[PDB]
Amino acid sequence: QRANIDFERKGSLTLHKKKGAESEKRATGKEMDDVAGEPLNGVTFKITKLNFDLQNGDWAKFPKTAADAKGHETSTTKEVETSGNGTAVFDNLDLGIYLVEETKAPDGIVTGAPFIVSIPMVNEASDAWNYNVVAYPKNTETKTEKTVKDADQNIQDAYTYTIKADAPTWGKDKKLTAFRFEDELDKRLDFQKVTEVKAGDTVLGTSDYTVNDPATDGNKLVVTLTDEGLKKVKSGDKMSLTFEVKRKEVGNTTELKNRADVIFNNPNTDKEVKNKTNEVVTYHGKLKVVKKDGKEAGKVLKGAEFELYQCTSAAVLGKGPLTVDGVKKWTTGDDGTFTIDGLHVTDFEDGKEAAPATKKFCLKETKAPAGYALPDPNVTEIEFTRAKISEKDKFDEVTLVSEIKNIKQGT
Ligand SMILES: [Ca+2]
């Protein structure tokens, strides 16, 4: 039998796309059953026939890497997306040298580097020519998540944001050359400090990263890893950033949203990868108290003193007197009112619906205006929920108003 190449034959390329760690094992070009990772559907591959002649050209001069292929591209191309078991088949292929590139991939996928394939090929000199080439390209799934720890933290109380992100994987020629966290903070927020930067289970020191100054940087936070920092990062490590903030005021809406970004190099293609987190929400509103004379019609009262408590009901006071923005006692003004700017809603915390919505606020009247008796009970429980603060009474959307009555002493 002849061992020659049959140039009246047509070849094929079969890609078995995998989600996982790179193959530092040079592939046979034949079937391998290397299901180390999970099959990845949705990745598109583009093959490009190169000018090189297998029939009459010098094979010693043929490209062996994606870099050597540059400048030898032809108009003959084909695009296929992975479908069943993360498989893309390129059929009725003219014999020749092809460049294989990833054109599209799903969200969070860090693609592998482009590669070169010969149709036909041999793994070993003793093998028969192989016209049906099989390759196992690799990819890495990198997820980015944002959480908020803001339970019982009112206006000017420090609360934290935490950004979690999967670092990419890198081969032994390849490396992680850049890695940063970006977060555009709402104008109502004041950055406090970065509390923790973690690479896997390794808590980094302040020499391993840099912090910009959000106040003079349009309220945008940037936390970049230095050269020292990067050295501590291992392939595919779970990166973490916890930083502290204070909400200055309630503002125009009860809700305050946060979303962040992670930017790193693709170790294989060296091109920048931006990854965006989910959006998290913190809710605060204002509490307005109006002191009224119970028996004397349409009359407000100056000089009524109050304290604020956490409570399950008016008969059962919890934490308090509470300090909200350096004040732990409020007195009604010349208009018979005061406004606490502001408090954490009782029905939504740490980024989710409160379970159970048992928390309430309690106003304790500590002193009645001159010539007025101290009401009994002197405690008013408040259902400070998003829905109740949202109600309007033109007689607003971010303020909940509480009417409290006092009666003149003696009679
Ligand atoms: Ca309201």
Numbering used by the authors: 42 to 436, 440 to 455
What text does the study give?
After testing several different constructs of SpaD, we were able to obtain diffraction-quality crystals from a construct containing residues 27–455, comprising most of the mature full-length SpaD but lacking the C-terminal sortase motif residues. Improved crystals of the full-length native SpaD were then obtained by cryocooling the crystals under high pressure, which enabled data processing to 2.5 Å resolution. The structure was solved by molecular replacement using the structure of the truncated form (SeMet SpaDtryp) as a search model. In the final model, one protomer is complete apart from residues 27–41 (the N-terminus) and 437–439, whereas in the other a large loop between residues 63 and 76, smaller loops between residues 212 and 214 and residues 435 and 436, and the C-­terminal residues 454–455 could not be modelled owing to insufficient density. The angular ‘bend’ between the D1 and D2/D3 domains differs in the two molecules of the asymmetric unit, however. Aside from this, the two copies of SpaD in the asymmetric unit are very similar, with r.m.s.d.s of 0.28 Å between the two D1 domains over 126 Cα atoms and of 0.51 Å between the two D2/D3 domain pairs over 264 Cα atoms. Interpretation of the electron density showed the clear presence of three isopeptide bonds in the structure of SpaD, cross-linking the first and last β-strands of the CnaB-type domains D1 and D3 and the first and second-last strands of the CnaA-type D2 domain. The isopeptide bonds link Lys58 and Asn180 in the D1 domain, Lys187 and Asn299 in the D2 domain and Lys332 and Asn450 in the D3 domain with the essential catalytic acids provided by Glu143, Asp224 and Glu406, respectively. The protein crystals used in the structure determination were from freshly purified SpaD and the three isopeptide bonds seen in the structure must have fully formed during the time taken for crystallization (one to three weeks at 18°C). In our SpaD crystal structure the pilin molecules are stacked end-to-end, bringing the C-terminus of one molecule close to a groove in the N-terminal domain of the next.
SpaD, the subject of this report, is the major pilin protein that forms the polymeric backbone, or shaft, of one of the three types of pilus expressed by the human pathogen C. diphtheriae. SpaD is an elongated molecule of ∼125 Å in length built from three tandem domains with Ig-type folds. As in some of the other Gram-positive major pilins, these three domains comprise a single CnaA-type domain flanked by two CnaB-type domains. Two crystal structures, of the full-length three-domain protein at 2.5 Å resolution and of a two-domain (D2-D3) construct at 1.87 Å resolution, show that each of the three Ig-like domains contains a single Lys–Asn isopeptide-bond cross-link, assumed to give mechanical stability as in other such pili.
